[PDB]
Design a protein around this ligand. Structure first.
Ligand code: BCL
Ligand code: BCL
Ligand code: BCL
Ligand code: BCL
Ligand code: BPH
Ligand code: BPH
Ligand code: MQ8
Ligand code: UQ8
Ligand code: CRT
Ligand code: HEM
Ligand code: HEM
Ligand code: BA
Ligand code: BA
Ligand code: BA
Ligand code: BA
Ligand code: BA
Ligand code: FE
Lengths: 60, 280, 40, 317, 318, 258, 60, 60
């Protein structure tokens, strides 16, 4: 089932400002979180040593 | 001598004990029957602390004897004496001095009581005082008692009592983990926060920027509500602060009461009940 | 709830549909999960 | 609740350690003191053995340690080593059946090394072991595997993205405190620096890190817990580093730390190749020794019961 | 018997008060109020409205970032097992860069998260500072809070930022964890030769005890004169009443001198600000100037001698 | 010589710095302490005819002016306050002796019944409307859901006799709360204030106890020069009377006990 | 459908707004939680370095 | 059904909104609680390697 013949009516019940701001916050949060989680697992995309060596030779 | 508005209140009576017998003033201090008793307990106490400083732990000629303010110390008797009176020169002195200190504090409290009765004010102060008196008693009476000997009390010396606190605390390995300790510390800290906030508020309103008039109750509430969305309000902050400080003393008294008598193992181990629940 | 007898029939209907739809998306995601990597 | 919680009743047993008023004291549960005493009971000796007879090395085929023992005494020693290390299994545990002289089963190459471990202990570490000495039982307790043997631990899991805290976890290793959870490998296996206190008031001549202080603290918590005592047992907490204000137990503990460095390094690690996976931790390191292993929560193993003096075969030469 | 003014026994409501008006520039106020019958049992029942400007929002922002790095790191340390996280939470923590790194910005997996949480936390704290000064100006008031907060910030900065940098090592700053930060405190004292003989920490301890003494006394006093509207300290300060008179006199007859309704708040203020100010000084000198306080105290002849009844020979000397 | 240990290290000199700032601080706080009640009252001043004003150490700080909002005034501290007779006589002519109140102790306005003369004007809201006013003047105010309405409870003195009944409730327009109880006195149907601090509730009974004064004393409660607001002066005058009963309302609060 | 007919009447006893926002609140929690649980076990899809050994296709 | 007799009058004593909200809360708590209990004991159904090895489905 997609959508009510009347699922506009949710905004007669829920404040558009609060729902909107909530969405903004939750989404930004989720983005940051998942980015962190990924940054802590294999899918790290930074400390890979590719595509060209940036620490020449050794120490750093 | 009196404040410029004091004579109108210096009424007669209100004692608990004594009546007109000691019902008079001396300079600015009120005497009263418990002040006379208090002064006796106090004077003999101090004068004895003076004799202890005079004799030293090994005699007046010994290198350990001292009048250096940081190092003079009168310590309790060994545990071998249990709850008996121990010889004067073997921790007895400390016992008597203790009796005098406890009696002086209880007298002091009762004198604040006669003073509340005189002025017609609440008895919040001496009640609150009684929490410090309670704390002092666990540290010299209750705990060493539950522990079968008065020697478990702390010594009366500026740094030696610090040493006492230190080794008794470390007998439990990591005292910071004492949960009542954690509480008490939080209250001492929170107390310190409310005090700093109240202080700041009153001084920030009764003395505003030049060019502004004494501020108002409305200002007071509007400010802490502006910053942190709440203002407990004038009255209540006086109520809270009293809660914080008295509770801080309370949890200190209980945090030390449980260190021995009700817990002998190290303290972090206590937290085991939490790592072992059947949830994990 | 200061609601009338009819504005909870309407609401209940819409709530029920949205909720079962939710449970539906749920069974979808769980089946994809069982397909790629069975767990029982 | 927020249950409440973990508590003992009054009055605790108490002992005065230092001078009156200094606060150096110890508290303990009488109940648990009696139960601990009952669980740390010693095995009675076997009657002494006569003889006066030839030396063990004259009547047996593969005797490389217990040489100068009389036959009788050797036999006695074998009966004790049997009940002491593996009584549910008996003689056959460390021997190839029918062949007392064979080393064709590992528990014997190991038993041999442990005969040299106990002998060394009782004769060379008295500044530590005094006249109580040690025996097989000390660690084995009717068990083939000392119940309280240890292994270097890896801690809980960490994703690949981050490295372990090295400290900060619920660990009954470090008394439940949060310090570092394996203060043993660097102190009871290796010989890293424990000292962090400066000997000068002003600074510029002590590089000790705060981190080093926490490691020393963790290790110390371990030690305290293994012997089942508090710092006032060895120290005067106003000055942990001050040796004159410490108790003669600090001296003893000093020599003990070295002793465990020797047990773990030249007697246990070498046996790692002939021991099964079942006796090894996740890094391949083997179950080794610590203070707990022997003390098992008491200042003197089995409340200082003197077992070794009855078996002369546990002493050098 | 007589009411003690502990619990408002009967409360009263009026439409919430959005407060005194701020001039142009101080943005609108947000959120709309509510009343908690129970807070009301002990205090103003009004909950909010709150003010949120650029400052305040940018601070809420930094602060929550910092709280996230600390937390996420703690979940990571028990392997994302939230059960385990819940189990060891008290013991969980985010340790600082290791010493091998000095004051360099370290890799994510070795402390870099701590430096980011430390960075963002401090910025968010000092932004909350500015916030409280702005919020304190719009009302024409003075900066007494801000001078105290500045004192407490001082101690904070001394703990995790000033001393580490001076000592050349982020590992000397304090780690984020309840029990871990307890351990940092204890280890701290041990490393520097018993912090008890450090005079500054004794004074700070005298001032903490003192914040408890003063708030206990003053609070008890004000409640005891709460029958005279002594809590209304503002008007007792401008138009001295028998509340401020009975109040000053209770103390006068007990200990021989006294202060006034306005001045007690100056004694209190200064005593709180003093804890944090001796405290920070105390940490400032640890390792930078003095390395072993017990020794320092011996050098200044303050450390007591007791009959040496128990002793141990030093194996390092055999 | 790369080792000449200096005996003075930064910690010494910093503890010195502390103590100096400390002393200046203590002194200063003790100066703010004399912005009221000073110079003191001795028979040293009166014996000398006044050439000995009592102030002690440190000394008194220059006056400071508080500029009250709303056409209120200007207050100073320290100020010069006109002496005020004592409504009592020396229990002894000897110094340090207390005085016995003149007349009917509760009327005396001495002792627990004493009080100063605060302004004969009203404390004001931010707006400038009488801060403390009754709920009858403060239309908006309202009891909190689930709290017995004081309005209509019976006020009863210390010996259990009815005094009157609560005819209204006074509230703070600045910090919403019950400040005063109004009492329609039984004995003369006149209206008096009763401070909340002196009133205890007995909710299941809808009573409002008062250990402070006796039912009869409610007859002498100081009165308001206007029934829809109250002045600072009047607040003190009202509370202090009740306070008196704490030592006067019975021939026994006088103490001793033994 | 197995359910009641007088089952709409439930929204005359319980405030609908609260029930609504609450469901999302609880669901977001459960979602994050369970995800973390799985992420902490054998079913993890991150901590392995696959199909290109990200942390050892240039590092190692 | 009922307990017996007249278990409708029970709602003349206990507020229905509250009893309801209380039960929902409690059940959610109890559920999370046990789920947590079973995973923490031998009856775990996640970190078992059952029915086939996963992390070592990233091993070979
Ligand atoms: C040493 C190792 C342990 C340690 C071991 C202990 C031990 C052991 C104790 C404490 C105690 C306490 N610790 Mg600790 N503590 C540690 C670390 C800390 C830390 C920290 C930052 O880490 C803090 C904040 C504290 C703080 C606290 C307080 C919670 C508490 C003392 C309150 C008190 O005495 O009230 C009570 C107040 C009084 C008793 C004074 C009573 C006043 C009397 C009636 C009047 C005296 C009048 C006198 C005559 C005045 C003289 C005036 C002249 C006459 C003019 N501890 C370390 C980790 N801590 C003590 C405690 O638990 O509470 C008792 C205690 O016994
Ligand atoms: C465990 C192994 C598999 C896995 C298997 C599954 C399975 C199996 C499921 C999910 C499901 C979820 N997974 Mg997954 N998932 C994996 C990897 C991921 C990754 C990732 C970074 O790799 C991400 C981001 C996700 C993300 C998610 C969420 C999108 C989703 C649950 C929705 C939810 O909780 O909201 C809760 C719902 C709400 C809060 C409300 C829903 C909308 C409402 C009804 C709208 C009404 C309007 C509302 C009132 C106003 C909106 C404002 C609110 C603020 C929203 N998965 C791993 C690889 N995943 C679930 C799913 O798909 O949904 C069926 C699911 O069943
Ligand atoms: C709580 C656990 C320990 C304890 C923990 C500590 C710690 C920790 C410290 C002190 C410190 C001190 N403690 Mg202590 N202290 C305890 C119980 C006591 C008792 C008691 C009889 O109950 C007393 C009188 C004291 C008194 C003192 C002073 C020696 C000193 C500073 C007090 C201060 O500023 O506090 C706030 C109170 C005030 C400001 C009121 C001012 C009154 C003055 C300061 C107290 C005068 C004491 C006087 C010099 C000697 C006592 C009177 C003699 C009988 C004549 N402690 C318990 C036993 N105490 C501090 C110190 O520097 O000592 C090295 C310190 O660091
Ligand atoms: C444990 C071994 C030592 C010990 C070692 C130390 C050490 C080390 C220290 C203290 C410190 C203190 N000790 Mg001590 N202390 C011991 C025994 C005691 C005893 C006792 C009865 O024996 C007492 C009373 C005390 C008392 C005290 C306090 C007086 C003092 C600082 C108080 C404070 O609040 O600062 C705390 C206040 C702050 C840090 C400011 C807070 C402001 C910040 C900005 C708030 C931010 C909030 C945040 C942004 C909100 C978001 C939260 C995020 C999750 C973070 N200690 C034993 C002897 N003690 C300090 C000290 O004295 O140094 C000289 C200190 O650092
Ligand atoms: C319980 C909450 C807090 C509190 C409350 C509190 N204390 C109070 C009061 C209240 C409400 C008073 O009204 C009362 C007071 O008068 O105000 C200053 C008091 C008091 N707070 C004081 C001290 C005090 N309170 C403290 C703490 C606390 N008190 C808590 C933080 C502390 C500490 C250790 O932090 C101290 C030091 C006193 C100034 C005063 C009570 C003084 C008094 O009663 O005087 C009579 C006694 C004497 C004059 C001395 C008697 C002589 C003795 C025979 C010798 C003393 C021997 C002593 C045991 C040796 C200790 C040696 C030290 C070097 C260790
Ligand atoms: C004399 C010094 C004493 C003191 C004084 C003191 N403390 C102070 C102040 C002062 C003068 C302030 O001005 C300030 C204050 O605000 O007081 C209420 C403060 C302060 N003291 C505090 C803590 C504190 N102070 C302490 C100590 C001390 N402070 C000493 C006792 C302690 C200790 C050691 O116990 C602590 C824990 C804070 C309440 C406050 C500083 C708060 C701060 O800096 O904020 C930084 C940022 C954050 C915390 C982020 C905000 C997190 C929010 C709660 C989340 C809200 C989320 C929201 C719903 C939005 C949605 C999120 C979106 C991203 C989606
Ligand atoms: C042998 C023989 C015959 C003896 C001879 C007699 C001798 C020796 C005489 C010497 C005389 C002198 C010099 C000494 C007397 C010593 C006495 C007896 C002891 C002092 C007792 C005493 C308690 C002193 C403690 C001092 C300290 C610093 C206490 C801490 C409390 C504190 C910080 C004090 C200052 C701040 C105070 C007083 C605040 C009180 C106060 C508070 C708290 C309010 O809230 C309030 C609200 C509204 C108006 C006023 C006030 C107010 O005044
Ligand atoms: C001028 O007036 C002022 C105002 O008025 C306008 C203000 O609004 C304000 C703003 C004030 C605020 C916003 C207040 C801020 C307060 C803060 C930040 C404190 C933090 C407190 C908490 C987070 C709550 C902690 C407490 C609890 C959770 C309760 C826990 C209960 C427990 C542990 C069990 C209780 C039992 C005990 C403690 C045992 C025994 C205790 C006693 C005997 C104590 C007795 C107490 C009394 C009060 C008589 C100020 C500063 C002001 O000065
Ligand atoms: C699963 O969890 C989710 C919700 C994600 C989030 C959960 C978060 C949680 C629960 C977090 C819990 C956090 C806790 C309990 C934290 C407790 C912390 C404690 C007790 C800390 C105690 C002391 C810490 C101190 C004093 C820290 C001091 C650090 C300082 C001063 C750092 C300063 C650093 C600076 C200024 C950085 C400078 C960077 C520069 C610019 C120099 O870089 C070049
Ligand atoms: C009552 C049971 C046992 C009997 C009768 C017994 C008997 C003997 C005999 C007769 C020998 C000499 C055999 C030879 O070298 O040719 C011997 C050697 C040895 N047995 Fe035992 N044994 C017993 C139990 C044990 C146990 C339990 C252990 C180990 C825990 C053990 C460890 C050894 C070792 C290591 C040797 C070689 C000794 C050395 O180099 O000094 N035996 N045993
Ligand atoms: C949990 C509380 C304890 C703490 C905090 C603690 C702390 C310390 C510290 C910091 C040192 C280093 C002092 C220096 O740097 O010179 C130390 C050394 C030492 N402690 Fe402990 N200790 C505890 C319990 C114990 C116990 C129970 C024993 C004895 C069984 C013990 C025996 C020793 C010995 C022998 C040394 C000297 C080590 C060496 O020089 O290599 N400690 N302790
Ligand atoms: Ba680079
Ligand atoms: Ba378990
Ligand atoms: Ba013990
Ligand atoms: Ba990669
Ligand atoms: Ba996998
Ligand atoms: Fe105040």
């Amino acid at each position: 089932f997609t959508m009510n013949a009347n699922l506009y009516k949710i905004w007669l019940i829920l404040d558009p400002r609060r729902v909107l701001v909530s969405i903004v916050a939750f989404q930004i949060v989720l983005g940051l979180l998942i980015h962190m989680i990924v940054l802590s697992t294999d899918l790290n995309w930074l400390d890979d040593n590719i595509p060209v060596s940036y620490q020449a030779l050794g120490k750093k | 001598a009196m404040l410029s508005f004091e004579k109108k209140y210096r009424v007669r009576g209100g004692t608990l004990i004594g009546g007109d017998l000691f019902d008079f003033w001396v300079g600015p201090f009120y005497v009263g029957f418990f002040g006379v008793v208090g002064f006796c307990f106090t004077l003999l106490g101090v004068l004895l602390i003076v004799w202890g400083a005079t004799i030293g732990p090994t005699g007046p000629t010994s290198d350990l004897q001292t009048y250096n303010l940081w190092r003079i110390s009168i310590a309790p008797p060994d545990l071998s004496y249990g709850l008996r009176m121990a010889p004067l020169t073997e921790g007895g002195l400390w016992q008597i001095i203790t009796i005098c200190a406890a009696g002086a504090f209880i007298s002091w409290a009762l004198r604040e009581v006669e003073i509340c009765r005189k002025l017609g004010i609440g008895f919040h102060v001496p009640f609150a005082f009684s929490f410090a008196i309670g704390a002092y008693l666990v540290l010299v009476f209750v705990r060493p008692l539950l522990m079968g000997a008065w020697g478990h009390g702390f010594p009366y010396g500026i740094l030696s009592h610090l040493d006492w606190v230190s080794n008794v605390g470390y007998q439990f390995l990591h005292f910071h983990y004492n949960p009542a300790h954690m509480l008490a510390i939080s209250f001492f800290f929170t107390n310190c926060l409310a005090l700093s906030m109240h202080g700041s508020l009153i001084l920030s309103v009764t003395n505003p920027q030049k060019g502004e008039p004494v501020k108002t109750s409305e200002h007071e509430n509007t400010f802490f509500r502006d910053i942190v969305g709440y203002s407990i309000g004038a009255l209540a902050i006086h109520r809270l602060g009293l809660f914080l400080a008295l509770s801080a003393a309370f949890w200190s008294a209980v945090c030390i009461l449980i260190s021995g008598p009700f817990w002998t193992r190290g303290w972090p181990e206590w937290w085991n009940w939490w790592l072992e629940l059947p949830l994990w | 709830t200061g609601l009338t007898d009819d504005e909870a029939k309407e609401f209940h209907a819409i709530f029920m549909q949205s909720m079962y739809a939710w449970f539906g998306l749920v069974v979808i995601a769980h089946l994809l999960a069982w397909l790629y990597r069975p767990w029982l | 609740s927020v249950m409440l919680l973990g508590c003992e009743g009054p009055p605790p047993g108490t002992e005065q350690i230092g001078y009156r008023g200094v606060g150096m004291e110890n508290y303990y549960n009488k109940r648990q003191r009696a139960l601990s005493i009952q669980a740390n009971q010693p095995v009675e000796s076997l009657p002494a053995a006569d003889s006066t007879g030839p030396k063990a090395s004259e009547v047996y085929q593969n005797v490389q340690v217990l040489k100068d023992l009389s036959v009788g005494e050797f036999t006695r020693t074998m009966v004790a080593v049997t009940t002491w290390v593996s009584p549910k299994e008996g003689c056959n545990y460390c021997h190839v059946p029918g062949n007392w002289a064979s080393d064709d089963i590992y528990t014997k190459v190991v038993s041999r090394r442990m005969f040299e471990l106990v002998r060394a202990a009782n004769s060379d570490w008295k500044a530590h072991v005094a006249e109580t000495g040690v025996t097989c039982y000390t660690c084995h307790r009717g068990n083939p595997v000392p119940k309280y043997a240890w292994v270097t631990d890896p801690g809980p899991k960490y994703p690949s993205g981050l490295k372990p805290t090295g400290q900060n976890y619920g660990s009954k290793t470090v008394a439940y405190a949060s310090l570092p959870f394996d203060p043993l490998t660097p102190f009871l296996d290796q010989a890293n620096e424990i000292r962090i206190t400066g000997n000068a008031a002003l600074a510029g001549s002590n590089p000790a890190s705060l981190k080093q202080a926490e490691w020393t603290f963790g290790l110390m918590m371990n030690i305290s817990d293994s012997l089942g005592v508090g710092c006032t047992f060895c120290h005067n907490t106003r000055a942990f580093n001050d040796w004159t204000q410490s108790t003669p137990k600090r001296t003893t503990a000093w020599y003990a730390i070295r002793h465990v460095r020797d047990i773990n390094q030249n007697y246990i690690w070498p046996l790692n190749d002939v021991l099964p996976a079942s006796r090894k931790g996740p890094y391949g390191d083997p179950l080794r020794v610590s203070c707990m292993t022997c003390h098992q929560a008491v200042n003197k193993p089995l409340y200082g019961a003197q077992m070794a003096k009855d078996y002369p075969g546990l002493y050098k030469t | 018997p007589e009411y003690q003014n502990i619990f408002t026994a009967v409360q009263v409501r009026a439409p919430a008060y959005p407060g005194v008006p701020l001039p142009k520039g101080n943005l609108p106020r947000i959120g709309r109020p509510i009343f908690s019958y129970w807070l009301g049992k002990i205090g103003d029942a009004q909950i909010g409205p709150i003010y949120l400007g650029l400052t305040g929002t940018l601070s809420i922002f930094f602060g929550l970032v910092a709280i996230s790095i600390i937390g996420f790191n703690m979940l990571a340390s028990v392997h994302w097992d939230v059960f385990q996280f819940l189990k060891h939470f008290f013991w969980l923590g985010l340790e600082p860069p290791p010493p091998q790194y000095g004051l360099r910005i370290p890799p994510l997996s070795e402390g870099g998260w701590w430096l980011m949480a430390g960075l963002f936390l401090t910025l968010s704290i000092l932004l909350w500072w500015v916030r409280t000064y702005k919020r304190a100006e719009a009302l024409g008031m003075s900066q007494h809070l801000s001078w105290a907060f500045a004192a407490a910030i001082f101690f904070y900065l001394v703990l995790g930022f000033i001393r580490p940098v001076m000592m050349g090592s982020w590992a000397k700053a304090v780690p984020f964890g309840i029990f871990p930060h307890l351990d940092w405190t204890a280890a701290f004292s041990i490393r520097y030769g018993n912090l008890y003989y450090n005079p500054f920490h004794m004074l700070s301890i005298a001032f903490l005890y003192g914040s408890a003494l003063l708030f206990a006394m003053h609070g008890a006093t004000i409640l005891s004169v709460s029958r005279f509207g002594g809590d209304r300290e503002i008007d007792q300060i401008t138009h001295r009443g028998t509340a401020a008179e009975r109040a000053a006199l209770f103390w006068r007859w007990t200990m021989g001198f006294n202060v006034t309704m306005e001045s007690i708040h100056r004694w209190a203020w200064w005593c709180a600000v003093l804890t944090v100010i001796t405290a920070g000084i105390g940490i400032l000198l640890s390792g930078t100037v003095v390395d072993n306080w017990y020794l320092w105290a011996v050098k200044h002849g303050m450390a007591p001698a007791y009959p040496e009844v128990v002793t141990a020979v030093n194996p390092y000397e055999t | 010589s790369a080792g000449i240990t200096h005996y003075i290290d930064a910690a010494q000199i910093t503890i010195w710095a502390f103590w100096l700032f400390f002393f200046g601080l203590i002194i200063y706080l003790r100066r703010e302490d004399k912005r009221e009640g000073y110079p003191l009252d001795s028979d040293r001043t009166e014996r000398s005819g006044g050439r000995v004003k009592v102030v002690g150490f440190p000394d008194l700080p220059d006056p400071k002016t508080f500029v009250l909002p709303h056409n209120g005034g200007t207050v100073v501290a320290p100020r010069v306050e006109a002496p005020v007779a004592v409504n009592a006589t020396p229990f002894s002519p000897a110094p340090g002796s207390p005085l016995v109140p003149n007349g009917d102790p509760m009327l005396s306005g001495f002792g627990p019944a004493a009080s100063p003369d605060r302004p004969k004007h009203c404390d004001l809201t931010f707006e400038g409307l009488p801060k403390i006013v009754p709920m009858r003047v403060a239309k908006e105010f309202s009891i909190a859901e689930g709290d017995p309405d004081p309005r209509g409870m019976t006020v009863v003195g210390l010996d259990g006799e009815v005094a009157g009944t609560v005819s209204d409730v006074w509230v703070d327009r600045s910090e919403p709360q019950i400040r005063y109880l109004e009492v329609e006195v039984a004995a003369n149907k006149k209206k008096v204030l009763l401070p909340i601090g002196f009133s205890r509730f007995d909710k299941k009974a809808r009573k409002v106890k008062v250990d402070a004064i006796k039912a009869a004393h409610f007859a002498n409660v100081p009165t308001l020069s206007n029934p829809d607001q109250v002045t600072l002066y009047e607040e003190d005058k009202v509370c202090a009377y009740y306070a008196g009963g704490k030592l006067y309302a019975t021939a026994e609060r006088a103490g001793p006990l033994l």
